[PDB]
């Protein structure tokens, strides 16, 4: 399964199976036991703008 969204860089370590914070507590939820992989990369060149 593939779920996709964009977050900030200073909060990606809120994403681990068993965590805290408003993207772990609210807005999304992992289980505690986990199989898959998580991949993230900055897109400030394209997704940020003046």
């Amino acid at each position, epitope marked *: 399964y593939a779920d996709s969204f964009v977050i900030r860089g200073d909060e990606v370590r809120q994403i681990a199976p068993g965590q*805290t914070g*408003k993207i772990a*507590d*609210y807005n999304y939820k992992l289980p505690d036991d986990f199989t898959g992989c998580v991949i993230a990369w900055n897109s400030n060149n394209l997704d940020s703008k003046v």
Partner: antibody
Framework: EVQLVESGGGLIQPGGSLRLSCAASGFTVSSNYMSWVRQAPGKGLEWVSV???????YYADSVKGRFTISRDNSKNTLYLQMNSLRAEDTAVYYCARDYGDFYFDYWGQGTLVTVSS | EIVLTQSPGTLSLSPGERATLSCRASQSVSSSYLAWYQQKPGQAPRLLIY???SRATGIPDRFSGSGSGTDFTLTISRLEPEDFAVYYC?????????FGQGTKLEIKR
């Protein structure tokens, strides 16, 4: 929206433990964040701890492993249980209603935490 | 680094004139994620303005905060004498919420 009375603090010898209480009124105390902030009597304002409406808590690094917050939304009473008291945690403390961005918009009255001496 | 540092630290003036002050960080902050506070001595400290843009209710409009990044100011358009207190800057951009040390506002009778 009249709320946030504080009580409980005072003279206490070091090494003890104390649960403070900040009761509010006219507000759904469950469905928001609250916080704690200290005020050293010669110095500025320093944040202590936060709770979430879901219920997650965070603390300052100095008070790590020492201080436990809790609440009873059946009686609308925040509980700051501080333990292993040292003689530099001698500030006056404030319960603070919290919004959103973690602005502390509504403020308590204050109560003195004074270490044994 | 995130440390709020007041510009002057105190101001002694005469009422009826435009008051202006700033608070300086120790790095550039993410955009306008800071606030101001005032403290009445012997009382509870109170809200001043969120986001350095607009202030909340219960506050009149004689006051204006501006700036971006390291510098971030606050301007009171006319000195009300009863507003003499200790005034704080507060941030919420960084992962802790750090504070400053305050600014004293008074008059020289």
């Amino acid at each position: 929206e009249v709320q946030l009375v504080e009580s409980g603090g005072g003279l206490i010898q070091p090494g003890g433990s104390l649960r403070l209480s900040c009761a509010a009124s006219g507000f759904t105390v469950s469905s928001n964040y609250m916080s704690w902030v200290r005020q050293a009597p010669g110095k500025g304002l320093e944040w202590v701890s936060v709770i979430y409406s879901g219920g997650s808590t965070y603390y300052a690094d100095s008070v790590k492993g020492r201080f436990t917050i809790s609440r009873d939304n059946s009686k609308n009473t925040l509980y700051l249980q501080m333990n292993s008291l040292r003689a530099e945690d001698t500030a006056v403390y404030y319960c603070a209603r919290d919004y959103g961005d973690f602005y502390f918009d509504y403020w308590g009255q204050g109560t003195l935490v004074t270490v044994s001496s | 680094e995130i440390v709020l540092t007041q510009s002057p630290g105190t101001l002694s003036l005469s009422p009826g004139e435009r008051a202006t002050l700033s608070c300086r960080a120790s790095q550039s902050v993410s955009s306008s994620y800071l606030a101001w506070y005032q403290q009445k001595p012997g009382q509870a400290p109170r809200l001043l303005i969120y986001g350095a843009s607009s202030r909340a209710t219960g506050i009149p409009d004689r006051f204006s905060g501006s700036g971006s990044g390291t510098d971030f100011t606050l301007t009171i358009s006319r000195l009300e004498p009863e507003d003499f207190a200790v005034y704080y800057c507060q941030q919420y951009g960084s992962s802790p919420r750090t504070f400053g040390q305050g600014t004293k506002l008074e008059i020289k009778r």
